C-alpha cells in the first residue's frame, strides 16, 4: 500500500539522511515500489522545500505508494512538536495505548498510530503513547522507540523484530556500545512498570527524551546520570553531523 520516512531538518541539514534514505529505499524494494528519484534529487527536493517553506528547522516527510495501481512520491513539511528547554529538562508524560503494528519492521502509513492516539495524547498532555500488544508487552511509541531502566540499573528495549528499528534507536545502541552500557533486548510487560526506575523515548521527531511518567507511574528518568549521558552523547552526534555539512 504505502510507506513513509520522516527526517529532522536542523540549520537546513536533513539529519542522518543516508540512514533514512537507505531504510526508505530498502522498504520500497520490499513492498515492490522503487522510488523514482536518486539521493541527489531527493536531497534537492528537500533543499527546494527548505528554500520555499522559508524556516530552517522542522520535519520533512517522504511518502512512497502505489495508488489505483500507479506509483507516487511526495515530500512535504509536517508540524514539528519541538520540546523547549524546560520540557527537555523535566522530561515528558506518556500514556499506554492498546495496539499492534502489522509489519512492524517497515514504516507503513497503515502501521502509524499518530491519528489513533492524537485525542488521548491531547487530553492527557502526553508527548507520546506507548503501544501495548495483545500479550501486554510495551513495544514502542507511536513515533518512537522506548528504552527502560530497571531498578537493577540495566537498560532494556523491545527486540528489533517486534518494533520499527529506528535510526535513533540504532544511534543510541551505538552510544551505549561505545560507552560499555549493556542493553538487553527483551519483551517488557506492563507488569514490569513496577520494576523500572526510568525510561526514555528515541526518534527523529523526539531526539532522546527522558520520560517523567507512564500513566500514573512516576519515574526519576530526567535525574538518572546514564539517561542524561545518552541525551548528551546524542546531541553531540547531531552537532557533528550538522557541523560537517554547514
Short description:
The chain is of the alpha+beta class.
| Strands, count | 14
Distance between the termini: 37 Å
Please tell me the CATH architecture of the largest domain by its name: Alpha-Beta Barrel
Fraction in beta strands: 25-35%
CATH topology of the largest domain: D-amino Acid Aminotransferase, Chain A, domain 2
> How are helices and strands ordered from N to C?
EEHHEEHEHEEEEHEEEEEH
Please summarize the sheet with the most strands: 10 strands, mixed
CATH class value of the largest domain: Alpha Beta
Q: Could you estimate the helical fraction of the residues in percent? A: 25-40%
Protein name: branched-chain-amino-acid transaminase
GO cellular component, one term: cytosol
Catalytic activity: L-isoleucine + 2-oxoglutarate = (S)-3-methyl-2-oxopentanoate + L-glutamate; L-leucine + 2-oxoglutarate = 4-methyl-2-oxopentanoate + L-glutamate; L-valine + 2-oxoglutarate = 3-methyl-2-oxobutanoate + L-glutamate
Cofactor: pyridoxal 5'-phosphate
Structure description:
It catalyses: L-isoleucine + 2-oxoglutarate = (S)-3-methyl-2-oxopentanoate + L-glutamate; L-leucine + 2-oxoglutarate = 4-methyl-2-oxopentanoate + L-glutamate; L-valine + 2-oxoglutarate = 3-methyl-2-oxobutanoate + L-glutamate. This protein is an alpha+beta fold and 246 residues long. The chain has two domains: 79 residues, Aminotransferase class 4, branched-chain amino acid transferase, N-terminal domain (D-amino Acid Aminotransferase, Chain A, domain 1); 156 residues, D-amino Acid Aminotransferase, Chain A, domain 2 (Alpha-Beta Barrel). Helix content is 33%, strand content 32%. Strands 5, 6, 7, 8, 9, 10, 11, 12, 13 and 14 form a ten-stranded mixed sheet that branches. A four-stranded antiparallel sheet has the order 2-1-3-4. Helix 5 packs across helix 6.
Amino acid at each position: 500500500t504505502a510507506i513513509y520516512e520522516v527526517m529532522q531538518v536542523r540549520q537546513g541539514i536533513p539529519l542522518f539522511f543516508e540512514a533514512h534514505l537507505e531504510r526508505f529505499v530498502m522498504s520500497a524494494s520490499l513492498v515492490g515500489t522503487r522510488i523514482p528519484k536518486k539521493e541527489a534529487e531527493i536531497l534537492h527536493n528537500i533543499a527546494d522545500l527548505v528554500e520555499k517553506n522559508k524556516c530552517d528547522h522542522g520535519n520533512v516527510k517522504l511518502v512512497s505508494a502505489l495508488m489505483n495501481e500507479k506509483e507516487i512520491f511526495l515530500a512535504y513539511f509536517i508540524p514539528a512538536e519541538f520540546l523547549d528547554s524546560k520540557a527537555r529538562l523535566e522530561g515528558v508524560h506518556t500514556i499506554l495505548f492498546s495496539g499492534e503494528r502489522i509489519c512492524p519492521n517497515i514504516k507503513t502509513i497503515k502501521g502509524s498510530f499518530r491519528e489513533q492516539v492524537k485525542a488521548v495524547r491531547e487530553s492527557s498532555n502526553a508527548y507520546e503513547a506507548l503501544l501495548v500488544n495483545e500479550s501486554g508487552h510495551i513495544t514502542e511509541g507511536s513515533r518512537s522507540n522506548v528504552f527502560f531502566m530497571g531498578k537493577d540499573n540495566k537498560l532494556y528495549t523491545s527486540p528489533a523484530g517486534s518494533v520499527l528499528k529506528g535510526v535513533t534507536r540504532t544511534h543510541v545502541m551505538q552510544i551505549c556500545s561505545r560507552l560499555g552500557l549493556e542493553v538487553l533486548e527483551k519483551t517488557v510487560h506492563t507488569r514490569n512498570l513496577a520494576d523500572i526506575q526510568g525510561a526514555f523515548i528515541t526518534g527523529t521527531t523526539v531526539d532522546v527524551t527522558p520520560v517523567r511518567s507512564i500513566g500514573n507511574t512516576q519515574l526519576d528518568s530526567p535525574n538518572i546520570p546514564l539517561i542524561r549521558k545518552i541525551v548528551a552523547e546524542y546531541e553531540k552526534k547531531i552537532a557533528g553531523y550538522v557541523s560537517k555539512r554547514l
